[PDB]
């Protein structure tokens, strides 16, 4: 009769670079027990700020325990290291973690993980980060590098949609047309985005990543000789030999500047496959980028 | 039929959870819930049920026994090894855990390195059946110097006249007559030297009668001079032979 | 000079006989032999422990970035083609940057050709590669070190 | 006993009739593990 979820009261929120904005001087507001968590339904310390000039006054949505558990932002619900949905990262690494959906089991599991984290060092996304050591499979290809500030854009003025926004240019909300309501990208359940179940953004990025054969190769009839284009005279056979020395023993390494192709062949099929996958539009040696294909 | 089976499983799980919540300390509800989950081929659900029951009361022998038997009845051998390691490290004085761990790692496991694991039990000074089973296990693995060290530690840890007689019989059966004579001499020098047990002297006289009848007659005369009716019977047997 | 072919190292994991690449790197082999004679690599815990890539021990600082060699302050990493960080049982120095190497020895059971050009290989593990592979298979924290500390008990630089 | 089974059969028949035509703050045991307690790991295991 004396078990309940403890209230998470802590400073220093864990946010992305994009949602934090671009100004080095940010004015910041904190409520001690302002709102509830959007997932585990516990009260938590709510942080609110304006990321920039014409932004939305973004505020934290989920509690710090859930965000430390899934290694995501407290507002964007995207991964801190890569800026991806957690469904995409779970498809990349491991999807056997899961979480309960019924509220009593969810509160019990969250209390157990909170006690485990509080008995730990304090800032560690459990052993899942231990399963996150293997990386750069395909997630680095579609990961953003620039801060996408267009998701800090303000909301659409509903009075302007009906054509009755009497504020005009004084209205801070957007006086532009919204997205298509018939589009299935516009559903976006928050619990579905947190749990990584049927998120349409994750499905669209998985379909986009599946159409980019950056690790396919294998266009030769059991021949290890593959041609990497884009090398030219800038990349010589020494860089190809240094790249193939990690795979073991190389059968042949050569570079031809007449066709600007590096011919790489290995005595092992697995080493030649790894050398073709590493050089398929992802290898840069001596200032020259190589794309692997049949030769 | 799938929806009816799901409703039946939901009703059975609701009644099992209500029986758990009504009386938490009654472990038979936990055992029945875990066996019903194992009968529906849900290994991880029954493992979670058993882990919850061990969190409720870890001192029960039957919870560990049933959860290790459920791990061993399936193909989860390493899970059963982890379960037995936890059961040994929490409850070392329960010999049934040791016996079933050694039968699991000896018959099904067939690993000789489990004998090194068995040496962990030899840190705990168990009852004499553990020493006898380890003697017979080292004989089944065809080791006699190791079994000599085992029986020497058995004599040092649990000294008894029957233990010294078993050491003499094991040294005689392993074709080490000089070691058997030295063990009989050490047993005469230490075990009942002033207590006058008059039973290790009879075994030494029997070993000498197997070896040389003059030393057997001398041992029978020394036993008759040191002393019962059995010593007089042994002296009459030595005089008749 | 000091050009030992193979040395021995006894630790908590076991005893390993490691060959020294004195043919291609005689100065680094002499510095490693002098550090083994002075006990610089003996008794120091494993500062760097990668996830089954390279396990480095013998660093006196313990953070993986410090340490002192027998040549004085820091040792320049002169890599050679005869001693390269490749294959299984490659012995090298875990250098964080170029031209800065201590007396620490790192055993690698996996391919490390990317870090082979920035570090000088002390030799190869002729024996005890399985003990180094079992030591490197243990999980570590974010500081490339676990909670338990493993060091080197004795070192014999024979030769 | 039998009356409760007949009531459950009638409720299942009414549910199938309504499907052919909240959760009351409960815990659904058929959807996931109710209180998931993972087994302790040590010295072994390669999963399945």
């Amino acid at each position: 009769t004396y078990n309940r979820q403890n209230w998470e009261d802590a400073d220093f929120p864990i946010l992305c670079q994009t949602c934090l904005g671009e100004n080095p001087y940010i004015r910041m507001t904190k409520e001690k027990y302002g709102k509830e968590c959007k997932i585990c339904a516990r009260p938590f310390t709510v942080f609110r700020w304006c990321p920039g000039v014409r932004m939305r006054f973004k505020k934290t949505e989920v509690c710090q325990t859930c965000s430390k558990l899934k290694n995501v932002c407290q507002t964007c619900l995207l991964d801190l290291e890569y800026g991806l949905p957690i469904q995409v990262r779970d498809a990349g690494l491991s999807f056997k973690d899961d979480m309960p959906k019924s509220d009593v089991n969810k509160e019990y599991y969250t209390q157990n993980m909170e006690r485990e984290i509080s008995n730990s060092d304090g800032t560690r996304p459990v052993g899942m980060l231990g399963k996150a050591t293997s990386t750069s499979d395909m997630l680095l290809k579609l990961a953003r590098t620039t801060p996408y500030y267009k998701r800090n854009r303000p909301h659409i003025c509903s009075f302007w949609v009906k054509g009755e926004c009497k504020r005009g240019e004084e209205c801070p909300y957007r006086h532009e047309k919204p997205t298509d309501p018939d589009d299935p990208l516009a559903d976006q359940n928050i619990k579905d985005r947190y749990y990584g179940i049927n998120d349409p953004v994750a499905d669209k990025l998985l379909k986009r990543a599946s159409t980019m054969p950056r690790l396919d190769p294998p266009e030769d009839k059991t021949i290890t000789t593959l041609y990497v284009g884009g090398l030219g005279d800038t990349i010589t056979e020494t860089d190809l030999r240094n790249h193939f020395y990690q795979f073991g023993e190389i059968r042949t390494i050569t570079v031809v500047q007449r066709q600007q192709c590096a011919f790489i062949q290995f005595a092992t099929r697995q080493a030649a496959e790894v050398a073709a996958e590493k050089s398929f539009n992802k290898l840069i040696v001596n200032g020259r980028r190589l794309n692997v294909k049949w030769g | 039929d799938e929806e009816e089976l799901n409703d039946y499983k939901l009703r059975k799980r609701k009644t099992f959870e209500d029986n758990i919540r009504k009386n938490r300390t009654v472990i038979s509800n936990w055992i029945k819930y875990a066996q019903w989950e194992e009968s529906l081929k849900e290994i991880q659900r029954a493992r979670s049920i058993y882990e919850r029951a061990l969190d409720v009361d870890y001192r029960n022998i039957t919870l560990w026994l049933k959860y290790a038997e459920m791990e061993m009845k399936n193909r989860q051998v390493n899970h059963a090894r982890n379960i037995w390691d936890r059961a040994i490290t929490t409850l070392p004085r329960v010999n049934q855990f040791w016996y079933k761990y050694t039968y699991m790692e000896e018959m099904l496991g067939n690993v000789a390195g489990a004998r090194q694991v068995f040496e962990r039990w030899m840190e705990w000074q168990p009852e004499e059946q553990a020493w006898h089973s380890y003697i017979n296990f080292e004989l089944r693995y065809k080791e006699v110097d190791r079994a000599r060290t085992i029986y020497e530690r058995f004599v040092l840890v649990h000294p008894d006249v029957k233990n010294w007689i078993k050491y003499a019989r094991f040294e005689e059966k392993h074709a080490y007559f000089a070691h058997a004579r030295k063990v009989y001499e050490r047993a005469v020098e230490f075990f009942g030297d002033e207590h006058m047990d008059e039973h290790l002297y009879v075994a030494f006289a029997k070993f000498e009668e197997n070896q040389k009848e003059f030393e057997r007659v001398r041992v029978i005369y020394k036993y008759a001079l040191d002393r019962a009716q059995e010593l007089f019977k042994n002296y009459t047997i030595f005089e008749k032979k | 000079s000091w050009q030992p072919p193979n040395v021995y190292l006894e630790t908590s994991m076991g005893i390993i006989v490691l060959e020294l690449y004195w043919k291609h790197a005689p100065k680094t082999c002499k510095n490693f032999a002098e550090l083994a004679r002075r006990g610089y690599y003996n008794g120091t815990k494993f500062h760097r422990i990668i996830k089954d890539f390279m396990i480095q021990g013998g660093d006196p600082t313990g953070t993986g970035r410090g340490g002192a060699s027998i040549y004085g302050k820091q040792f320049e990493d002169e890599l050679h083609p005869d001693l390269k960080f490749t294959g299984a049982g490659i012995l090298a120095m875990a250098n964080a940057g170029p031209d800065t190497n201590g007396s620490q020895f790192f055993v690698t059971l996996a391919p490390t050709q990317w870090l082979d050009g920035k570090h000088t290989i002390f030799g190869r593990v002729c024996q005890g590669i399985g003990m180094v592979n079992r030591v490197g298979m243990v999980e570590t924290n974010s500081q490339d070190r676990p909670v338990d500390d493993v060091k080197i008990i004795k070192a014999y630089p024979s030769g | 006993k039998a009356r409760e089974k007949q009531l459950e059969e009638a409720r299942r028949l009414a549910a199938l009739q309504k499907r052919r035509e909240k959760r009351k703050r409960g815990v659904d045991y058929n959807a996931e593990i109710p209180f998931e307690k993972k087994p302790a790991l040590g010295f072994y295991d390669t999963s399945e």
Binding site: - | - | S12, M13, Y21, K84, T86, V138, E139, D148 | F43
Partner: peptide
């Protein structure tokens, strides 16, 4: 050079595996 889930086993001195 010329070649081209479990837990951590802890052993102290002659003590075979710290349990």
């Amino acid at each position: 050079p010329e070649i081209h889930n479990a837990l951590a086993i802890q052993v102290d001195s002659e003590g075979k595996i710290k349990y």
